[PDB]
Every structure is written in C-alpha cells, then in structure tokens.
Design a protein around this motif. Structure first.
Motif, PDB file in Angstrom:
ATOM      1  N   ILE A 393       0.846  -1.179   0.000  1.00 11.30           N
ATOM      2  CA  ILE A 393       0.000   0.000   0.000  1.00 11.30           C
ATOM      3  C   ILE A 393       0.884   1.232   0.000  1.00 11.30           C
ATOM      4  N   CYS A 519      -3.855  -0.257   7.337  1.00 12.43           N
ATOM      5  CA  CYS A 519      -3.637  -0.452   5.907  1.00 12.43           C
ATOM      6  C   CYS A 519      -3.978   0.831   5.145  1.00 12.43           C
ATOM      7  N   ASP A 520      -4.564   1.800   5.855  1.00 11.73           N
ATOM      8  CA  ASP A 520      -4.930   3.079   5.268  1.00 11.73           C
ATOM      9  C   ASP A 520      -5.952   2.847   4.156  1.00 11.73           C
ATOM     10  N   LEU A 521      -6.987   2.061   4.468  1.00 11.36           N
ATOM     11  CA  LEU A 521      -8.038   1.750   3.515  1.00 11.36           C
ATOM     12  C   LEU A 521      -9.338   2.402   3.968  1.00 11.36           C
ATOM     13  N   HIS A 542      -8.673   2.225  -1.233  1.00  8.07           N
ATOM     14  CA  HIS A 542      -7.701   3.038  -0.527  1.00  8.07           C
ATOM     15  C   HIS A 542      -8.215   4.472  -0.451  1.00  8.07           C
ATOM     16  N   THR A 543      -7.724   5.223   0.540  1.00  6.52           N
ATOM     17  CA  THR A 543      -8.247   6.550   0.828  1.00  6.52           C
ATOM     18  C   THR A 543      -8.039   7.446  -0.393  1.00  6.52           C
TER      19      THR A 543
END
Ligand SMILES: *O[C@H]1[C@@H](O)[C@H](n2cnc3c(=O)[nH]c(N)nc32)O[C@@H]1COP(=O)(O)OP(=O)(O)OP(=O)(O)O
Ligand SMILES: C[S@@+](CC[C@H](N)C(=O)[O-])C[C@H]1O[C@@H](n2cnc3c(N)ncnc32)[C@H](O)[C@@H]1O
Ligand SMILES: [Zn+2]
Ligand SMILES: [Zn+2]
Lengths: 678, 284
Positions: A393, A519-521, A542-543
RNA sequence: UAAAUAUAGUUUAAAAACAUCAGAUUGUGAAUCUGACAACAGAGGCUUACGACCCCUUAUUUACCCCA
C-alpha cells in the motif's frame, strides 16, 4: 544381503528460504528427514521421486519441520502410496488430526505415526533409533535425534579364490553353495570343512549416521550428556560415518558442542545445515526470472542470492555415499550462472528481436505495487508456486492476499536481506478459503514475522488475519496440541467484512477499525464467491480512491462483479483453459475467457489472471481477447498502476520466450480434440 | 597394452566374453571409459563370434550334405544368366533415373551426433535403402548430400561397397541440398514436424536425415530444417495407424519403401505396410 | 503424476527363419558358392552371472487431469 548403494543427499541446505531436509537413498527404501515448507517442490524440481518414500523422520514438532508435511501427504496420496510412517515426536498424531480439518478425510493413504516411544524401525536397509532430547529449563522442549545403522552386508564371493585352492568354479552349479559362501557357513568342498569367510570379502560392520537437531542454546547441554550418543562416541566396534547438524551457527561455535563433535571419531564426517549456506535451491525460478528480467527489469526483478572440527557446509544436492565407498559426491551440485541463462534466452528464435523491438516501442503513483509471489494451483511446480499476492500500500504498509506453503520462501528470494522490513511492514493477511494452498504458508509468515520484528526492534503485536472461521479451528488445534501460534493472530472472520454484515462483538468491530487504519483503507469488503462454500473475495479501497479486487478461487460470480464495480485492478483466476468449461463447472473454477468476461462486467481498468493449473503453467494460453486490459502473472512479477500500458506490449516478448511450451500446450489441445473425436 | 592382459581376468570370471579379440577391437576397448560400457562391448563380440561359429557349423554341415548328394546323383531358349542380366537391367534403369528421375536426398550431416555403433547401422540402412531404390520400377535419383570425402560415414560406405562405390548410380557430394536444388521445392522429412504429409508431391525434393539416434536426440532433423528455412513434413502415422508401442522415427530403409510406393501411385495403406507391425495394431 | 512399454531391416522365440550388401558369363538345385554386416531404446550401477534388480535420459501408450 542388504542394499549396496546408500547415500545421503541434501534436499534443503538450511537457508532461511528452504530450511533443512535430508534425503536418504537405498536400493530398497527411501527416507526423508524433516518436511519443511517447500521440500515437495525442491524434490520434484530435482527429480527425487516422493512416490517411493517409506518413512518421513521429523526431528522437532515445529512448523519449520512439518510445514510441508500436510503437503506431501496430499500428493503422495495421489501417486497412490498405500502407507507412510511418520517417525518423530508423539504429538505428530494430533498434528495429523489437525491437518484433516481442511485437508479432507485423507483416506486412500495410511499414515501411521511411530513416535520415539516405539521400538526401533527395522528395514532392508537400516535400523533407525529415535533419541528423545529435552531442553534445559504439547512439548516445546522435545527434539528427536536419529541414529541410523545400516544392516550387515554379506561379503562378495571371490570365485578366483575358490579356484585358487582348487574348489570348483561352478558359476551356476555351486550357486546354492555360493549362497552359503555369502552367508559365511563352512564349506564341505575341497575335501575339508573350509570356512566361507576366506572365500568371501570381509563383511563391513555397517555404517551409522546421526541426524541431530539442536535448535538453540538450550539443547546443547542435554545433547552432550546423552547416554545413547555416548555409546556411539569412542566405542571402537561402533563407528559413526556422518553426523548431520541442523544447528545454527551460534550453537556449533559453543565449546560444549565442539567438544561433543570431537568425541565422535576423527574419521567421522560432519555435515552442517544452517543459514550460512544461502545456496540456490530453486534453479528454474532463478533461470526464468533472469530471462524474464531481459524483457522488463522493473516488472520482472532479479532474485537475490548469496572451527576446531572440520565441518562441511551443506549445499543443495550434496551427496555423501555410504556404500560401496564413503566419500563426498559433489556431482549434482546446483550451479547457477546468470550469464548462461542470458545467452540461452538470446539464442531463442525470436526472443532477441521481440525484446529489442519492445525497447524501440517504449522510447500514476508508484504505490501500490502488487507483487505476485506465486500464481499456481494445488501442487507446486518449478516455475509457479501456490497462491500469494503481496500488495504494498505504501513504503511502510503491505497486505498479503493468500499465503501458501512456499510463500515465505518466495518472499525471501524476492527480497533477500530486505525481507525483515517487509515482514514488519505486513499488516493483514487475507485467506480466500480453506483449500490447503491458501493458508498452509501462514504459520511460517507468523513465525518469521516474529523474527523480523525482533531484528528491527519493533514491538511484537498480532497479525490481522481475514479468513473463514474454519481457519481458527485448524489453528486452535495446532496451538493446543503442537505449537503456540495463536498469540500471533488477531483474526477477523471474513463474514464480518461482508456488505450488510451484522455488527459482530465489539472486539471484532475494534479489530476491523484497526484493519482499516493500519492499511490506510477506506473499505475492506468481502463477498461469498462460488467455490465449494466458505470462499471469499476481497475488495481493497484506498483513501486515495483506487480499488483493487481479489477473486480467489471461484467461478463467474455476480456478487464479486457487483462488489468490484469500476475497480482499478482485478485479480481473477484462470485455472482452466477455454474449451474445458465442463472441467470448470465441477471443480468450481474459471476459464480464461470467463475470467476476462467477469473483469469486463466490472469495468476494471486492468485484469490480472492467477491460480493457473500446471496443465497451463510455463505459459498460460493467451486468448486473443482484450489485449490492452488483460495481463498474465508470473512468480516474482511486480505490477504497478504505471505498468498497465506496458503489460500489453510484454506479450510479444513473453510469447517468444515461452514459444517452446506454447507449442506443446497447443498440441495437448489438439490431441484432446482428436481424443474427443476418437 | 594393459587391455590385452586386462581382458584375461574378465575371461576367468565368465562375463560373456569371446575367445579372441583382434588388435583393431583392442583399440575400441580403450575407447570405453566405463566398466558398464566395456560390458556391452564384450557381449556384442561374444554374440558375434557365436553366430560366426553357428553359421560355419551349419555351413560345413550343408557342404557335407551337398557333396553326398552329388555322389547319389534339351531345348532351352535361354542360358541361366538371370542374376547377371537383372543387374544390367537395373543398371540401365539407374542411368535413366540419374537423368530424369525424381531427386531424393540423404543428408549426411549427422556424423557429429552419432557414435561408432550408430554410424555402422546408418551405413547398413543406407545399403538397404539404395537396394530397394535400385530394384524398383521407378527409382529415385539418390543424392548423398553433406558427405565429407574423408568422413567416417564416407569411409564406412566405401568399405561396404568396395569397388562398387564408384560405380553406384547415385550422386554423392560434399555440397548441401540447398545448394543443389531450389529452396522452395525442398521438403525435409522428420517425425517432429508439425506439418503432416497429406499427399506425395512429384515436384518436391524430399530430404531424409541419415541419422540413427539410438541415444535419442529429438528435434535435431527439425533444427537443421529450421536453421535453413526449409519446409518440414511428418508421416501420417497417427492418422492411419493405431500406435501402441515403439518409436515413431522409422529406419531409412522403411522410409524409402514408404516413399517408393507412394510415388508409384499407391495409397497410404499400401505405403504404411512397411511400418513395423509390432508398433501398431491395424489401420483406422 | 502413475503405470506398463521400447527388437533400428522384418518377425518369432525365450536364438533361428526371412531379408540386406560385394564378388560370380550359372548348361538350367545359382533351390548355389566365396566374402561383408551381426549390438532386443539410451546412460550408469550392483552382483558369481542375468534381457532379472536399482537409477537416470528419451520415446510410446494409457489413466489422470492439475493436491481429485
Ligand atoms: O511431474 C510432472 C507433472 O507434475 C506434470 N505433468 C505433465 N503432464 C501431466 C499429466 O498428464 N498428468 C499429471 N498428473 N501431471 C502431468 O509435469 C511434470 C513433468 O514436467 P517436466 O519438468 O518433466 O517437464 P516440462 O513440462 O518442464 O518440460 P518442457 O515442456 O518445458 O520441455
Ligand atoms: C530415425 S529418423 C532420425 C531421428 C532424429 N532424431 C530426427 O529428429 O529425425 C531417420 C530419418 O527418417 C525420416 N523419418 C523417420 N520417421 C519419420 C516420420 N514419422 N516422418 C517423417 N520422416 C521420418 C527422417 O528424415 C529422419 O531424419
Ligand atoms: Zn487455488
Ligand atoms: Zn481453491
């Protein structure tokens, strides 16, 4: 009268990749010591037939030792081996029961565990002793050492010697008596009761070798004060030929271990299997990747490769012969020369021109990167392992889509020294379903992650695993009975992350939050795909905005299509080939055409195919459909979003490289059609 | 040499060795680098002398039977000179063939890939092949291509043919087939060819690889036929025969006899009658 | 992947028969004589020996379809 060619061959030389495994060969019986993750492949690749194995001896009850054990049983079940004996710790019994949770009934083959408590295993070749060694301050403390003593061999008949004294030659006539001559019984011939000892060659007393594992510093003292070892140390009538040490470097350097090694005769050869070797094991992977590297260095990166007692450092396919001579045979040593692979690739019909013309043609964020660690189904092969996809990621976050036997090894040969940072980077593991090729690699990653966290100095915390509930039961049993692993896992059931899922317990809800945050999702969805039940595909959003979708093993699924709408990347499976649609419906798989059609319904910007069969392994049969949107995964293939336009252009070079294998696969298709007609 | 004394101890052990070995064969005993290879060589000489003895014993048995028969013991149109006259007749056909006949090429570029054992067998097969061509009603014009003058295969051919070598009605040249014929009209025959032979073409030159690879090297004929951009064809063995056992790579003598009857306006059945019967179980 | 299987002229047998090559001016058994060629897929082992027994390579067939 006993086997006449016995040798030990080193399957795995003890590197972090492969672990240690020792293959013992005789005319009559074949043995294997240990069964790490990837022994199955290391053996198939090097033409060591597993179909002939009698006993697998395991020194410890550790995933290092038994990782690939659940692996062979599946496979040598197929070969159709009626019986196999697992010798080692008593807890192997419960291990087999744990395996059956996901592996099916394991009928058709008989597995009898003979532990160290049992009396000795006598064979044509050898009688094997199990020595139970318990560490100094479910058993973590148990290792087993093996002393394998070859049977007495009858002396060779000297026909010249018989005729020297005047005894009839009688190549066929006195042959019944020749058997008595072999047996050494006194011979009435020559007019006197001549003992047959002088007629035959001296019978060798028999060679013994020791396979001793000393995992760490605990076990050193117990080994050095072992009564059973002391019997074979210094006793003139009983010499030990070889000792195979699976201890690390730290253990061997110890004065106490050195002294103990010296106590075996000066004539004793000592073999060491540990991390110091770092020899090449998977030659064909190295070869292919070196050639693929020509096509595109970025998308196809290079695989990383590397005192008192005289010790011989374990190398792959190193051989020690016990009969009919004692010697080190280094003939079948694995030699890897990248330059040779390059020259061979360049000499191919159209590979040079295709690659050159690709460069002429040539002249989005860097993250994520999708690393394809392995892109094959079921039985692992030379070129494709079982299922693993690594999603990076960010420089500091990664997520592992499926993790199968061999997976950590793929990671380790992909990253080499940099595998420590990658392991510490790892946040989540997703397991699509409970087929033994989607999860069997998990315990290695868990254990190796611990090792990586310690080295980087980072705090040890559990790994978030998204998997079906059935996985917990397998792991709970392994934790209960065999080895502690459950402290490494915070498992989120895959059904919790489904769209419109009922709010689970606050523990799971809090775990889910940490999954997204680490995971910054923005989303992590799962859906029930059509693969023999309790099978899931995931979607990462993802963001930033990009979505990547993993099918796993499945058929054309409406749910997955609805989920992964306008995905950036789809990872779907093409296990079967087009025209094998009737195979797909029963195995619950996809064909290449079906997989692509699913992609097109999702409006995926790009589609990658994985979980190919071996039937289409060396090169998946490239259907003419949708060139620009469809890509094919190899092991150790890195794909970014930037590489989407180059992937179409790689087909002409790839096809040239794998032209040989394309022909044969096309003939299989043609022959099948002919077979269908006839 | 030590080999002369070496074989003595092997004789005592009775490892199927013959009575005597000629000095020529001693040299070939030195070639063998293995006990196993020596064993296979000695057995060959063992069986060779056995058949020599048996034939001789059966010979003088016949001779003794013939002489006693003699003791016990018109208007013709022709004198009995049939063998002589047939040889002349086949000569005239051979000369006619050399002028007008269809070419057929044996490529002799395979000496490198063959051992001594396989090399004699190639010459034995070539001898049979030319024979069937000679005796045919419509002979091929046989070309030996890529035959080095001083090569092993040339030396062996000269030995077996003796003075007849010069008088054979075939063309031997060091040149290649691509040098002698237009490149488009050359069809290279090999079992490894993807292209199946559908019908015999009278406008085409067929190249047969003089290659007996008991130690199987697959694709070598194909590799040559690709390095030079030649057309390759394979026989329709799969189509017409129920293949069960054996190699699909036929011998030279079989190949020519298949082609000869194909050329002579036969069908594939009549042609494939020369395919060894042990290899298939009838026509489908 | 596993099984059997592999006759380099062809068969059979467990060595022969029929073929091949060179020579021959043959009084009509030349239905012969004198020579040539003789290698049960290939490589390496074990053994007193073996085409058995082990191993590898290639090939064929069939079964499997890939860890069902
Ligand atoms: O070990 C075998 C096996 O795994 C697989 N294989 C091939 N055909 C079949 C089949 O019909 N059934 C089964 N069960 N398994 C099959 O292939 C392996 C052998 O492959 P090799 O490594 O010997 O050869 P490779 O394909 O690499 O050769 P090439 O095509 O590159 O020349
Ligand atoms: C025994 S083959 C030589 C085998 C060699 N490995 C190869 O690749 O051809 C001898 C020759 O006979 C011919 N031949 C044999 N079998 C054939 C087949 N089935 N189809 C076509 N040609 C064949 C080829 O010309 C070949 O070179
Ligand atoms: Zn799978
Ligand atoms: Zn699956």
């Amino acid at each position: 009268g006993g086997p006449n060619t016995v040798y030990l061959q080193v399957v795995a030389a003890g590197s972090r990749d492969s672990g240690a495994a020792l293959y013992v060969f005789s005319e009559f019986n074949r043995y294997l010591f240990n069964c790490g993750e990837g022994v199955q492949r290391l053996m198939q690749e090097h033409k060591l037939k597993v179909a002939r194995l009698d006993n697998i001896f395991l020194t410890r009850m550790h995933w290092s030792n038994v990782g690939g054990l659940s692996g062979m049983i599946l496979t040598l079940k197929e070969t159709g081996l009626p019986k196999c004996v697992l010798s080692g710790p008593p807890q192997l019994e419960k291990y087999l029961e744990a395996i059956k949770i996901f592996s099916g009934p394991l009928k058709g083959i008989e597995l009898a565990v003979r532990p160290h408590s049992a009396p000795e295993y006598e064979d044509e070749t050898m009688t094997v002793y199990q020595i139970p060694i318990h560490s100094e301050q479910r058993d973590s403390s148990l290792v087993v050492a093996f002393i394998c003593k070859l049977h007495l061999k009858r002396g060779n008949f000297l026909v010249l010697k018989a005729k020297e004294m005047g005894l009839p030659v009688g190549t066929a006539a006195i042959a019944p008596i020749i058997a008595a001559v072999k047996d050494g019984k006194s011979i009435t011939h020559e007019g006197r009761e001549i003992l047959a000892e002088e007629l035959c060659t001296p019978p060798d007393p028999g060679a013994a070798f020791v396979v001793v594992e000393c995992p760490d510093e605990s076990f050193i003292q117990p080994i050095c004060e072992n009564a059973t070892f002391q019997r074979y140390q210094g006793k003139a009538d009983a010499p030990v030929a070889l000792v195979v040490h699976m201890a690390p470097a730290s253990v061997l350097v110890d004065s106490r271990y050195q002294q103990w090694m010296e106590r075996f005769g000066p004539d004793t050869q000592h073999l060491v299997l540990n991390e110091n070797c770092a020899s090449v094991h998977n030659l064909r992977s190295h070869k292919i990747q070196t050639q693929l590297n020509l096509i595109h260095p970025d998308i196809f990166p290079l695989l990383t490769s590397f005192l008192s007692v005289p010790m011989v450092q374990g190398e792959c396919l190193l051989k020690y012969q016990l009969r009919p001579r004692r010697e080190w045979q280094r003939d079948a040593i694995i030699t890897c020369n990248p330059e040779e692979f390059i020259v061979e690739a360049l000499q191919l019909p159209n590979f040079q021109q295709s690659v050159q013309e690709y460069r002429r043609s040539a002249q989005r964020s860097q993250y994520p990167e999708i690393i394809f660690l392995g892109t094959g189904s079921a039985i692992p092969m030379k070129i494709r392992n079982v299922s693993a996809t690594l999603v990076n990621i960010s420089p500091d976050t990664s997520l592992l889509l499926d993790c199968g036997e061999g997976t950590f090894g793929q990671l380790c040969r992909h990253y080499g020294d940099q595998v420590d940072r990658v392991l510490g980077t790892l946040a989540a593991v997703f397991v699509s379903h409970l087929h033994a090729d989607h999860h069997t690699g998990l315990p290695s990653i868990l254990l190796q992650r611990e090792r990586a966290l310690a080295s980087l100095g980072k705090p040890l915390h559990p790994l978030l695993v998204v998997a079906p509930n059935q996985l917990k039961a397998w792991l709970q049993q392994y934790h209960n009975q065999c080895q502690e692993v459950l402290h490494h896992i915070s498992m989120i059931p895959a059904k919790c992350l489904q769209e419109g899922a009922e709010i689970s317990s606050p523990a799971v809800e809090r775990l889910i939050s940490s999954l997204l945050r680490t995971c910054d999702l923005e989303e992590f969805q799962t859906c029930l795909v059509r693969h023999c039940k309790h099978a899931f595909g995931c979607a990462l959003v993802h963001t930033s905005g990009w979505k990547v979708v993993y099918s796993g093993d499945t058929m054309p699924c409406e749910a997955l299509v609805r989920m992964g709408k306008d995905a950036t990347l789809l990872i779907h499976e093409a296990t079967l080939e087009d025209g094998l649609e009737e195979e797909a419906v029963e195995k619950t798989h996809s064909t290449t055409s079906q997989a692509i059609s699913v992609g097109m319904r999702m409006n995926a910007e790009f589609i990658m195919l994985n979980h190919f069969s071996q039937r289409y392994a060396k090169v998946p049969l490239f259907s003419p459909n949708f060139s620009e949107k469809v890509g094919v995964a190899f092991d150790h293939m890195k794909v970014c979003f930037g590489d989407f336009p180059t992937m179409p252009k790689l087909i002409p070079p790839l096809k040239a490289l794998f032209a040989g294998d394309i022909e044969e696969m096309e003939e299989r298709r043609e022959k099948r059609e002919l077979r269908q007609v006839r | 040499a030590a080999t002369r004394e070496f074989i003595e101890m092997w004789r005592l052990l009775g490892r199927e060795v013959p009575e005597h070995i000629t000095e020529e064969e001693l040299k070939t005993l030195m070639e063998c680098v293995s006990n196993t290879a020596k064993k296979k060589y000695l057995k060959y000489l063992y069986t060779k002398e056995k058949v020599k003895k048996a034939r001789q014993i059966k010979k003088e048995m016949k001779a003794a039977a013939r002489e006693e028969a003699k003791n016990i013991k018109k208007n013709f149109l022709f004198l009995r000179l049939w063998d002589r006259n047939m040889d002349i007749a086949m000569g005239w056909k051979g000369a006619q063939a050399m002028q007008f006949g269809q070419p057929l090429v044996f490529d002799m570029a395979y000496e490198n890939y063959m051992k001594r054992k396989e090399l004699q067998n190639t010459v034995s097969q070539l001898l049979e092949s030319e024979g069937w061509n000679r005796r045919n009603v419509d002979p091929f014009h046989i070309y030996f291509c890529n035959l080095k003058i001083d090569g092993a295969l040339h030396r062996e051919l000269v030995k077996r043919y003796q003075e007849k070598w010069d008088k054979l009605l075939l063309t031997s040249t060091e040149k290649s087939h691509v040098d002698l014929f237009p490149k488009d009209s050359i069809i290279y025959l090999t079992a490894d060819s993807p292209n199946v032979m559908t019908t015999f073409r009278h406008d085409k030159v067929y190249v047969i690889g003089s290659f007996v690879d008991k130690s199987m090297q697959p694709g070598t004929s194909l590799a040559k036929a690709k390095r030079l951009n030649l057309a390759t064809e394979c026989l329709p063995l799969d189509k017409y025969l129920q293949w069960e056992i054996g190699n699909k790579n036929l011998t030279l003598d079989q190949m020519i006899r298949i082609l000869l009857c194909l050329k002579n306006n036969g069908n594939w059945q009549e042609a494939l009658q020369f395919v060894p019967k042990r290899k298939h179980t009838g026509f489908l």
